[PDB]
Design a protein around this ligand. Structure first.
Ligand SMILES: [Ca+2]
Ligand SMILES: [Ca+2]
Lengths: 266, 269
Protein backbone atom coordinates (compact mmCIF):
# COMPACT_ATOMS: atom_id res chain seq x y z
CA UNK A 1 0.00 0.00 0.00
CA UNK A 2 2.88 2.34 -0.79
CA UNK A 3 2.53 1.40 -4.44
CA UNK A 4 1.90 4.09 -7.03
CA UNK A 5 -0.97 1.86 -8.16
CA UNK A 6 -2.82 2.18 -4.83
CA UNK A 7 -5.48 4.89 -4.88
CA UNK A 8 -4.01 8.32 -4.17
CA UNK A 9 -0.30 7.47 -4.32
CA UNK A 10 0.27 9.29 -7.60
CA UNK A 11 0.58 12.23 -5.23
CA UNK A 12 4.34 11.69 -4.77
CA UNK A 13 4.81 12.22 -8.50
CA UNK A 14 2.75 15.36 -8.00
CA UNK A 15 4.81 16.76 -5.08
CA UNK A 16 7.85 16.15 -7.26
CA UNK A 17 6.57 19.02 -9.43
CA UNK A 18 6.42 21.53 -6.58
CA UNK A 19 9.79 20.22 -5.40
CA UNK A 20 11.38 21.33 -8.70
CA UNK A 21 10.41 24.94 -8.05
CA UNK A 22 11.80 24.73 -4.52
CA UNK A 23 15.02 23.14 -5.72
CA UNK A 24 15.37 26.08 -8.10
CA UNK A 25 15.07 28.33 -5.09
CA UNK A 26 17.57 26.14 -3.24
CA UNK A 27 20.16 26.31 -6.04
CA UNK A 28 19.78 30.09 -6.31
CA UNK A 29 20.56 30.59 -2.62
CA UNK A 30 23.34 28.04 -2.63
CA UNK A 31 25.05 29.94 -5.44
CA UNK A 32 24.34 33.30 -3.79
CA UNK A 33 25.96 32.20 -0.53
CA UNK A 34 29.06 31.02 -2.36
CA UNK A 35 29.28 34.44 -3.98
CA UNK A 36 29.24 36.32 -0.70
CA UNK A 37 32.16 34.12 0.36
CA UNK A 38 34.25 34.70 -2.76
CA UNK A 39 33.67 38.42 -2.23
CA UNK A 40 34.72 38.39 1.40
CA UNK A 41 38.02 36.76 0.44
CA UNK A 42 38.71 39.21 -2.38
CA UNK A 43 37.86 42.13 -0.17
CA UNK A 44 40.19 40.94 2.56
CA UNK A 45 42.95 40.44 0.02
CA UNK A 46 42.71 44.06 -1.24
CA UNK A 47 42.64 45.42 2.28
CA UNK A 48 45.76 43.48 3.15
CA UNK A 49 47.38 44.68 -0.07
CA UNK A 50 46.52 48.26 0.83
CA UNK A 51 47.94 47.83 4.35
CA UNK A 52 51.26 46.57 3.17
CA UNK A 53 51.75 48.54 0.00
CA UNK A 54 51.76 51.43 2.48
CA UNK A 55 53.83 49.84 5.28
CA UNK A 56 56.46 48.67 2.79
CA UNK A 57 56.54 52.15 1.29
CA UNK A 58 56.93 54.06 4.56
CA UNK A 59 59.45 51.56 5.95
CA UNK A 60 63.26 51.24 5.53
CA UNK A 61 63.09 48.52 2.84
CA UNK A 62 64.58 49.82 -0.39
CA UNK A 63 66.04 48.88 -3.76
CA UNK A 64 64.80 45.96 -5.83
CA UNK A 65 63.93 43.78 -2.83
CA UNK A 66 61.46 46.45 -1.80
CA UNK A 67 59.83 46.00 -5.19
CA UNK A 68 59.94 42.18 -5.09
CA UNK A 69 58.24 42.31 -1.73
CA UNK A 70 55.71 44.76 -3.15
CA UNK A 71 54.98 42.39 -6.05
CA UNK A 72 53.20 40.21 -3.50
CA UNK A 73 50.51 42.81 -2.79
CA UNK A 74 50.17 42.90 -6.57
CA UNK A 75 49.19 39.23 -6.67
CA UNK A 76 46.79 39.90 -3.75
CA UNK A 77 45.13 42.52 -5.90
CA UNK A 78 45.06 40.43 -9.09
CA UNK A 79 43.82 37.34 -7.21
CA UNK A 80 41.17 39.38 -5.43
CA UNK A 81 39.84 40.63 -8.75
CA UNK A 82 39.58 37.01 -9.94
CA UNK A 83 37.45 36.08 -6.94
CA UNK A 84 35.36 39.19 -7.35
CA UNK A 85 35.00 38.13 -10.98
CA UNK A 86 33.85 34.69 -9.81
CA UNK A 87 31.25 36.37 -7.60
CA UNK A 88 29.75 38.21 -10.53
CA UNK A 89 29.84 35.27 -12.93
CA UNK A 90 27.74 33.55 -10.24
CA UNK A 91 25.22 36.32 -9.68
CA UNK A 92 24.80 37.86 -13.12
CA UNK A 93 25.21 34.76 -15.21
CA UNK A 94 24.33 31.67 -13.14
CA UNK A 95 21.81 32.75 -10.53
CA UNK A 96 20.02 34.62 -13.31
CA UNK A 97 20.02 31.60 -15.62
CA UNK A 98 18.11 29.71 -12.93
CA UNK A 99 15.84 32.68 -12.14
CA UNK A 100 14.60 32.93 -15.72
CA UNK A 101 14.22 29.20 -16.35
CA UNK A 102 12.31 28.95 -13.06
CA UNK A 103 10.26 32.01 -14.10
CA UNK A 104 9.21 30.48 -17.43
CA UNK A 105 8.88 26.80 -16.51
CA UNK A 106 6.50 27.32 -13.59
CA UNK A 107 3.45 29.52 -13.95
CA UNK A 108 1.83 30.23 -10.66
CA UNK A 109 -1.93 30.32 -10.81
CA UNK A 110 -2.85 33.93 -9.86
CA UNK A 111 -5.20 32.23 -7.38
CA UNK A 112 -2.65 29.72 -6.08
CA UNK A 113 -0.21 26.81 -6.53
CA UNK A 114 1.25 25.96 -9.95
CA UNK A 115 -0.65 25.41 -13.21
CA UNK A 116 1.74 22.50 -13.73
CA UNK A 117 0.92 20.80 -10.43
CA UNK A 118 -2.86 21.20 -10.96
CA UNK A 119 -2.74 19.68 -14.46
CA UNK A 120 -0.94 16.57 -13.21
CA UNK A 121 -3.10 16.26 -10.12
CA UNK A 122 -6.17 16.66 -12.34
CA UNK A 123 -5.07 14.14 -14.94
CA UNK A 124 -4.12 11.43 -12.43
CA UNK A 125 -7.47 11.81 -10.71
CA UNK A 126 -9.37 11.50 -13.99
CA UNK A 127 -7.19 8.54 -14.95
CA UNK A 128 -8.03 6.95 -11.59
CA UNK A 129 -11.74 7.91 -11.45
CA UNK A 130 -13.32 4.63 -12.62
CA UNK A 131 -10.72 2.45 -10.90
CA UNK A 132 -11.35 4.21 -7.60
CA UNK A 133 -15.09 3.71 -8.04
CA UNK A 134 -14.79 0.01 -8.78
CA UNK A 135 -12.31 -0.25 -5.93
CA UNK A 136 -14.97 0.88 -3.45
CA UNK A 137 -17.67 -1.22 -5.13
CA UNK A 138 -15.27 -4.08 -4.38
CA UNK A 139 -14.88 -3.01 -0.76
CA UNK A 140 -18.59 -3.45 -0.11
CA UNK A 141 -19.14 -6.66 -2.08
CA UNK A 142 -16.31 -8.17 -0.05
CA UNK A 143 -17.51 -6.90 3.34
CA UNK A 144 -21.10 -7.99 2.68
CA UNK A 145 -19.58 -11.35 1.70
CA UNK A 146 -17.07 -11.81 4.50
CA UNK A 147 -20.00 -10.94 6.76
CA UNK A 148 -22.35 -13.52 5.24
CA UNK A 149 -19.52 -16.07 5.52
CA UNK A 150 -18.85 -15.51 9.22
CA UNK A 151 -22.65 -15.50 9.74
CA UNK A 152 -23.29 -18.75 7.86
CA UNK A 153 -20.52 -20.35 9.93
CA UNK A 154 -22.57 -19.20 12.91
CA UNK A 155 -25.97 -20.77 12.22
CA UNK A 156 -23.99 -24.02 12.05
CA UNK A 157 -30.06 -22.59 5.75
CA UNK A 158 -31.20 -19.12 4.67
CA UNK A 159 -27.68 -18.18 5.80
CA UNK A 160 -26.08 -20.42 3.15
CA UNK A 161 -28.34 -18.90 0.52
CA UNK A 162 -27.22 -15.38 1.42
CA UNK A 163 -23.59 -16.50 1.02
CA UNK A 164 -24.22 -17.73 -2.53
CA UNK A 165 -25.74 -14.32 -3.32
CA UNK A 166 -22.90 -12.25 -1.84
CA UNK A 167 -20.18 -14.52 -3.23
CA UNK A 168 -21.76 -14.21 -6.69
CA UNK A 169 -21.78 -10.39 -6.61
CA UNK A 170 -18.31 -10.25 -5.10
CA UNK A 171 -16.89 -12.37 -7.93
CA UNK A 172 -18.64 -10.22 -10.54
CA UNK A 173 -16.84 -7.14 -9.22
CA UNK A 174 -13.54 -9.00 -9.42
CA UNK A 175 -14.50 -9.67 -13.02
CA UNK A 176 -14.98 -5.93 -13.65
CA UNK A 177 -11.84 -4.62 -11.98
CA UNK A 178 -10.02 -7.19 -14.08
CA UNK A 179 -11.53 -5.92 -17.31
CA UNK A 180 -11.05 -2.25 -16.31
CA UNK A 181 -7.55 -2.87 -14.92
CA UNK A 182 -5.66 -2.49 -18.22
CA UNK A 183 -7.15 0.87 -19.31
CA UNK A 184 -6.45 2.20 -15.83
CA UNK A 185 -2.79 1.33 -16.18
CA UNK A 186 -2.72 2.89 -19.66
CA UNK A 187 -4.37 6.03 -18.27
CA UNK A 188 -2.03 6.53 -15.32
CA UNK A 189 0.97 5.63 -17.49
CA UNK A 190 -0.03 8.48 -19.76
CA UNK A 191 -0.13 11.17 -17.08
CA UNK A 192 3.04 9.90 -15.38
CA UNK A 193 4.87 10.06 -18.69
CA UNK A 194 3.91 13.70 -19.13
CA UNK A 195 5.38 14.31 -15.68
CA UNK A 196 8.69 12.65 -16.59
CA UNK A 197 9.01 14.78 -19.71
CA UNK A 198 8.74 17.95 -17.60
CA UNK A 199 11.09 16.67 -14.91
CA UNK A 200 13.55 15.70 -17.63
CA UNK A 201 13.48 19.28 -18.89
CA UNK A 202 14.53 20.32 -15.44
CA UNK A 203 17.24 17.78 -14.68
CA UNK A 204 18.79 18.39 -18.10
CA UNK A 205 18.82 22.10 -17.33
CA UNK A 206 20.19 21.39 -13.87
CA UNK A 207 23.12 19.44 -15.26
CA UNK A 208 23.79 22.33 -17.64
CA UNK A 209 23.71 25.02 -14.94
CA UNK A 210 26.02 22.84 -12.82
CA UNK A 211 28.68 22.70 -15.51
CA UNK A 212 28.32 26.47 -15.79
CA UNK A 213 29.17 26.93 -12.13
CA UNK A 214 32.12 24.54 -12.22
CA UNK A 215 33.41 26.77 -15.01
CA UNK A 216 32.93 29.98 -13.05
CA UNK A 217 34.51 28.52 -9.94
CA UNK A 218 37.62 27.17 -11.70
CA UNK A 219 40.44 29.71 -11.48
CA UNK A 220 42.81 27.14 -12.94
CA UNK A 221 42.24 26.22 -16.59
CA UNK A 222 42.25 30.00 -16.70
CA UNK A 223 45.44 31.64 -17.95
CA UNK A 224 44.86 34.56 -15.56
CA UNK A 225 45.37 32.67 -12.31
CA UNK A 226 48.47 30.83 -13.52
CA UNK A 227 49.81 33.99 -15.06
CA UNK A 228 49.85 36.01 -11.82
CA UNK A 229 52.32 33.61 -10.28
CA UNK A 230 54.56 33.38 -13.40
CA UNK A 231 54.66 37.11 -12.99
CA UNK A 232 55.27 37.16 -9.24
CA UNK A 233 58.08 34.61 -9.58
CA UNK A 234 59.59 36.73 -12.36
CA UNK A 235 59.30 39.88 -10.21
CA UNK A 236 61.10 38.28 -7.31
CA UNK A 237 63.81 36.48 -9.28
CA UNK A 238 64.34 39.95 -10.69
CA UNK A 239 65.48 41.47 -7.38
CA UNK A 240 69.23 41.74 -7.11
CA UNK A 241 70.96 41.99 -3.72
CA UNK A 242 74.23 43.50 -5.01
CA UNK A 243 72.30 46.04 -7.10
CA UNK A 244 70.58 47.13 -3.88
CA UNK A 245 73.89 47.45 -2.06
CA UNK A 246 75.43 49.41 -4.95
CA UNK A 247 72.41 51.73 -4.74
CA UNK A 248 72.99 52.36 -1.05
CA UNK A 249 76.74 52.87 -1.30
CA UNK A 250 76.09 55.32 -4.12
CA UNK A 251 73.26 57.20 -2.29
CA UNK A 252 74.13 56.90 1.44
CA UNK A 253 77.68 55.56 1.72
CA UNK A 254 81.22 56.23 0.39
CA UNK A 255 79.75 56.52 -3.12
CA UNK A 256 78.16 59.86 -2.29
CA UNK A 257 79.94 62.82 -3.96
CA UNK A 258 81.90 65.03 -1.53
CA UNK A 259 83.27 68.59 -1.54
CA UNK A 260 86.57 68.15 0.28
CA UNK A 261 88.37 70.96 2.21
CA UNK A 262 89.77 73.71 -0.05
CA UNK A 263 91.27 77.20 0.53
CA UNK A 264 88.60 79.83 1.24
CA UNK A 265 89.26 83.52 0.54
CA UNK A 266 88.03 86.54 2.62
CA UNK B 1 76.66 68.64 3.85
CA UNK B 2 74.65 65.43 3.85
CA UNK B 3 77.39 63.36 2.26
CA UNK B 4 78.46 60.18 4.00
CA UNK B 5 81.91 61.71 4.12
CA UNK B 6 80.79 64.65 6.27
CA UNK B 7 81.42 63.97 9.95
CA UNK B 8 78.93 61.62 11.60
CA UNK B 9 76.86 60.93 8.46
CA UNK B 10 77.90 57.28 8.64
CA UNK B 11 74.85 57.28 10.92
CA UNK B 12 72.40 56.16 8.19
CA UNK B 13 74.55 53.11 7.53
CA UNK B 14 74.35 52.17 11.21
CA UNK B 15 70.60 52.67 11.26
CA UNK B 16 70.29 50.30 8.26
CA UNK B 17 71.31 47.55 10.67
CA UNK B 18 68.61 48.16 13.24
CA UNK B 19 66.21 48.63 10.32
CA UNK B 20 66.89 45.09 9.05
CA UNK B 21 65.84 43.71 12.40
CA UNK B 22 62.50 45.50 12.32
CA UNK B 23 61.95 44.54 8.69
CA UNK B 24 62.13 40.92 9.80
CA UNK B 25 59.27 41.67 12.16
CA UNK B 26 57.44 43.51 9.38
CA UNK B 27 57.78 40.51 7.04
CA UNK B 28 56.60 38.20 9.82
CA UNK B 29 53.45 40.23 10.57
CA UNK B 30 52.79 40.53 6.86
CA UNK B 31 52.93 36.80 6.32
CA UNK B 32 50.96 36.16 9.46
CA UNK B 33 48.11 38.47 8.52
CA UNK B 34 47.89 36.91 5.06
CA UNK B 35 47.72 33.50 6.64
CA UNK B 36 44.76 34.66 8.75
CA UNK B 37 43.00 35.73 5.58
CA UNK B 38 43.65 32.37 3.84
CA UNK B 39 42.37 30.59 6.95
CA UNK B 40 39.16 32.65 6.91
CA UNK B 41 38.25 31.77 3.31
CA UNK B 42 39.03 28.21 4.33
CA UNK B 43 36.51 28.23 7.17
CA UNK B 44 33.75 29.99 5.31
CA UNK B 45 33.97 27.44 2.50
CA UNK B 46 34.04 24.58 5.01
CA UNK B 47 30.95 25.97 6.67
CA UNK B 48 29.22 26.47 3.34
CA UNK B 49 29.97 22.90 2.23
CA UNK B 50 28.53 21.55 5.45
CA UNK B 51 25.33 23.59 5.52
CA UNK B 52 24.63 22.76 1.89
CA UNK B 53 25.67 19.11 2.00
CA UNK B 54 22.96 18.84 4.64
CA UNK B 55 20.31 20.90 2.87
CA UNK B 56 20.84 18.88 -0.31
CA UNK B 57 20.71 15.57 1.55
CA UNK B 58 17.45 16.43 3.23
CA UNK B 59 16.09 18.05 0.07
CA UNK B 60 13.76 16.54 -2.60
CA UNK B 61 16.69 16.21 -5.05
CA UNK B 62 17.50 12.57 -5.79
CA UNK B 63 19.70 10.36 -7.96
CA UNK B 64 22.65 11.35 -10.15
CA UNK B 65 21.86 15.01 -10.03
CA UNK B 66 21.91 15.03 -6.25
CA UNK B 67 25.36 13.47 -6.30
CA UNK B 68 26.41 16.02 -8.93
CA UNK B 69 25.11 19.04 -7.06
CA UNK B 70 26.70 17.51 -3.97
CA UNK B 71 29.98 17.24 -5.84
CA UNK B 72 30.33 21.04 -5.60
CA UNK B 73 30.26 20.95 -1.78
CA UNK B 74 33.18 18.60 -2.15
CA UNK B 75 35.28 21.01 -4.23
CA UNK B 76 34.48 23.61 -1.58
CA UNK B 77 35.96 21.19 0.96
CA UNK B 78 39.04 20.46 -1.09
CA UNK B 79 39.63 24.13 -1.91
CA UNK B 80 39.32 24.91 1.81
CA UNK B 81 42.03 22.35 2.60
CA UNK B 82 44.37 23.93 0.03
CA UNK B 83 43.97 27.37 1.64
CA UNK B 84 44.28 25.95 5.09
CA UNK B 85 47.65 24.63 3.96
CA UNK B 86 48.69 27.93 2.46
CA UNK B 87 48.10 29.29 5.94
CA UNK B 88 49.99 26.48 7.55
CA UNK B 89 52.97 26.88 5.29
CA UNK B 90 53.00 30.64 5.79
CA UNK B 91 53.12 30.16 9.54
CA UNK B 92 55.02 26.95 10.07
CA UNK B 93 57.52 27.14 7.21
CA UNK B 94 57.98 30.79 6.19
CA UNK B 95 57.28 32.94 9.27
CA UNK B 96 59.33 30.49 11.35
CA UNK B 97 62.19 30.68 8.84
CA UNK B 98 62.62 34.45 9.23
CA UNK B 99 62.23 34.14 13.03
CA UNK B 100 65.19 31.78 13.28
CA UNK B 101 67.23 33.89 10.91
CA UNK B 102 66.33 36.99 12.86
CA UNK B 103 67.35 35.25 16.10
CA UNK B 104 70.78 34.25 14.79
CA UNK B 105 71.51 37.55 13.04
CA UNK B 106 70.75 40.00 15.86
CA UNK B 107 71.89 39.88 19.46
CA UNK B 108 70.36 42.28 21.92
CA UNK B 109 72.70 43.21 24.73
CA UNK B 110 71.58 43.25 28.38
CA UNK B 111 72.76 46.88 28.41
CA UNK B 112 71.12 48.33 25.27
CA UNK B 113 70.75 47.66 21.55
CA UNK B 114 72.20 45.11 19.14
CA UNK B 115 75.75 43.82 19.34
CA UNK B 116 76.21 44.21 15.58
CA UNK B 117 74.98 47.82 15.60
CA UNK B 118 77.50 48.92 18.23
CA UNK B 119 80.29 47.09 16.44
CA UNK B 120 79.48 49.18 13.37
CA UNK B 121 79.32 52.44 15.22
CA UNK B 122 82.57 51.78 17.05
CA UNK B 123 84.09 50.95 13.67
CA UNK B 124 83.02 54.27 12.18
CA UNK B 125 83.97 56.37 15.22
CA UNK B 126 87.44 54.89 15.52
CA UNK B 127 87.88 55.36 11.75
CA UNK B 128 86.58 58.94 11.93
CA UNK B 129 88.38 59.88 15.15
CA UNK B 130 91.47 61.59 13.73
CA UNK B 131 89.74 63.04 10.71
CA UNK B 132 87.25 64.90 12.89
CA UNK B 133 90.02 66.38 15.02
CA UNK B 134 91.96 67.70 12.04
CA UNK B 135 88.58 68.79 10.80
CA UNK B 136 87.94 70.94 13.86
CA UNK B 137 91.45 72.40 13.79
CA UNK B 138 90.72 73.31 10.19
CA UNK B 139 87.67 75.25 11.40
CA UNK B 140 89.68 77.19 13.96
CA UNK B 141 92.43 78.04 11.52
CA UNK B 142 89.83 79.08 8.95
CA UNK B 143 88.06 81.60 11.18
CA UNK B 144 91.28 83.05 12.61
CA UNK B 145 92.53 83.74 9.08
CA UNK B 146 89.18 85.24 8.09
CA UNK B 147 89.03 87.47 11.17
CA UNK B 148 92.52 88.78 10.45
CA UNK B 149 91.28 89.58 6.92
CA UNK B 150 88.24 91.55 8.13
CA UNK B 151 90.32 93.32 10.77
CA UNK B 152 92.68 94.43 8.00
CA UNK B 153 90.02 95.53 5.51
CA UNK B 154 88.68 97.81 8.23
CA UNK B 155 92.15 99.24 9.06
CA UNK B 156 92.82 100.16 5.41
CA UNK B 157 98.96 103.27 9.62
CA UNK B 158 100.79 101.25 12.31
CA UNK B 159 97.50 99.39 12.77
CA UNK B 160 97.84 98.27 9.16
CA UNK B 161 101.38 96.97 9.77
CA UNK B 162 100.25 94.86 12.74
CA UNK B 163 97.20 93.63 10.83
CA UNK B 164 99.15 92.52 7.77
CA UNK B 165 101.41 90.57 10.13
CA UNK B 166 98.41 88.62 11.43
CA UNK B 167 96.80 87.79 8.10
CA UNK B 168 100.25 86.45 7.22
CA UNK B 169 100.89 84.58 10.50
CA UNK B 170 97.40 83.09 10.35
CA UNK B 171 96.97 82.38 6.62
CA UNK B 172 100.05 80.28 7.36
CA UNK B 173 98.26 78.07 9.90
CA UNK B 174 95.06 77.68 7.88
CA UNK B 175 97.30 76.71 4.96
CA UNK B 176 99.40 74.28 7.00
CA UNK B 177 96.24 72.40 7.91
CA UNK B 178 94.57 72.05 4.50
CA UNK B 179 97.84 70.31 3.69
CA UNK B 180 97.46 67.78 6.54
CA UNK B 181 93.78 67.19 5.81
CA UNK B 182 94.70 66.65 2.15
CA UNK B 183 97.50 64.25 2.96
CA UNK B 184 95.46 62.28 5.49
CA UNK B 185 92.29 62.05 3.44
CA UNK B 186 93.35 58.85 1.66
CA UNK B 187 93.70 57.04 5.02
CA UNK B 188 90.40 58.45 6.26
CA UNK B 189 88.73 57.12 3.14
CA UNK B 190 90.46 53.73 3.38
CA UNK B 191 89.25 53.33 6.98
CA UNK B 192 85.65 54.53 6.61
CA UNK B 193 85.60 52.33 3.47
CA UNK B 194 86.70 49.14 5.23
CA UNK B 195 84.03 49.56 7.90
CA UNK B 196 81.23 50.23 5.40
CA UNK B 197 82.26 47.07 3.55
CA UNK B 198 81.61 45.00 6.66
CA UNK B 199 78.20 46.60 6.83
CA UNK B 200 77.59 45.75 3.18
CA UNK B 201 78.47 42.09 3.73
CA UNK B 202 75.95 41.85 6.60
CA UNK B 203 73.10 43.54 4.70
CA UNK B 204 73.91 41.34 1.72
CA UNK B 205 73.31 38.22 3.83
CA UNK B 206 69.98 39.73 4.82
CA UNK B 207 68.80 40.81 1.37
CA UNK B 208 69.96 37.45 0.01
CA UNK B 209 67.91 35.52 2.59
CA UNK B 210 65.00 37.90 2.08
CA UNK B 211 64.94 37.06 -1.65
CA UNK B 212 64.96 33.38 -0.84
CA UNK B 213 62.11 33.75 1.67
CA UNK B 214 60.04 35.73 -0.88
CA UNK B 215 60.36 32.80 -3.28
CA UNK B 216 59.27 30.42 -0.51
CA UNK B 217 56.22 32.60 0.05
CA UNK B 218 55.36 32.75 -3.65
CA UNK B 219 55.40 28.95 -3.95
CA UNK B 220 53.18 28.58 -0.91
CA UNK B 221 50.58 31.14 -2.06
CA UNK B 222 50.35 29.58 -5.52
CA UNK B 223 47.61 26.94 -5.61
CA UNK B 224 48.76 26.37 -9.18
CA UNK B 225 52.18 25.09 -7.92
CA UNK B 226 50.41 21.79 -7.31
CA UNK B 227 48.40 19.59 -9.62
CA UNK B 228 46.04 19.19 -6.65
CA UNK B 229 44.22 22.37 -7.72
CA UNK B 230 43.70 21.19 -11.29
CA UNK B 231 42.57 17.76 -10.19
CA UNK B 232 39.79 19.26 -8.07
CA UNK B 233 38.01 20.92 -10.98
CA UNK B 234 38.93 17.97 -13.18
CA UNK B 235 37.20 15.75 -10.62
CA UNK B 236 34.30 18.17 -10.19
CA UNK B 237 33.52 18.32 -13.89
CA UNK B 238 33.71 14.54 -14.33
CA UNK B 239 31.26 14.21 -11.40
CA UNK B 240 28.71 16.46 -13.06
CA UNK B 241 29.22 14.86 -16.45
CA UNK B 242 28.47 11.63 -14.62
CA UNK B 243 24.95 12.97 -14.22
CA UNK B 244 22.31 11.10 -16.20
CA UNK B 245 18.90 12.75 -16.48
CA UNK B 246 17.12 9.81 -18.10
CA UNK B 247 18.63 7.33 -15.68
CA UNK B 248 17.34 9.31 -12.69
CA UNK B 249 13.91 9.34 -14.28
CA UNK B 250 14.04 5.61 -14.86
CA UNK B 251 15.10 5.24 -11.18
CA UNK B 252 12.07 7.27 -10.00
CA UNK B 253 9.70 5.35 -12.24
CA UNK B 254 10.50 2.07 -10.52
CA UNK B 255 11.01 3.59 -7.13
CA UNK B 256 8.00 5.90 -6.83
CA UNK B 257 6.04 5.43 -10.07
CA UNK B 258 4.39 2.88 -12.45
CA UNK B 259 7.38 0.54 -12.06
CA UNK B 260 6.62 -0.02 -8.38
CA UNK B 261 5.26 -3.55 -7.76
CA UNK B 262 1.57 -3.97 -6.93
CA UNK B 263 -0.68 -6.62 -5.42
CA UNK B 264 -3.67 -6.45 -7.75
CA UNK B 265 -7.15 -7.44 -6.42
CA UNK B 266 -7.91 -11.15 -5.84
CA UNK B 267 -10.45 -13.52 -4.25
CA UNK B 268 -9.99 -13.56 -0.45
CA UNK B 269 -11.81 -15.88 1.99
CA1 LIG C 1 60.36 51.67 1.47
CA1 LIG D 1 17.94 14.52 -1.23
Amino acid sequence: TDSFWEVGNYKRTVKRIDDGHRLCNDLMNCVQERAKIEKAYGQQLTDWAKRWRQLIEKGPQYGSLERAWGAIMTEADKVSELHQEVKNNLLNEDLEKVKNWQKDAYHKQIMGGFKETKEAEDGFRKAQKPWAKKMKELEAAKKAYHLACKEEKLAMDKCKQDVQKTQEKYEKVLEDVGKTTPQYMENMEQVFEQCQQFEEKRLVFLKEVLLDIKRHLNLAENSSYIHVYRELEQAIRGADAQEDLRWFRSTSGPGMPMNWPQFEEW
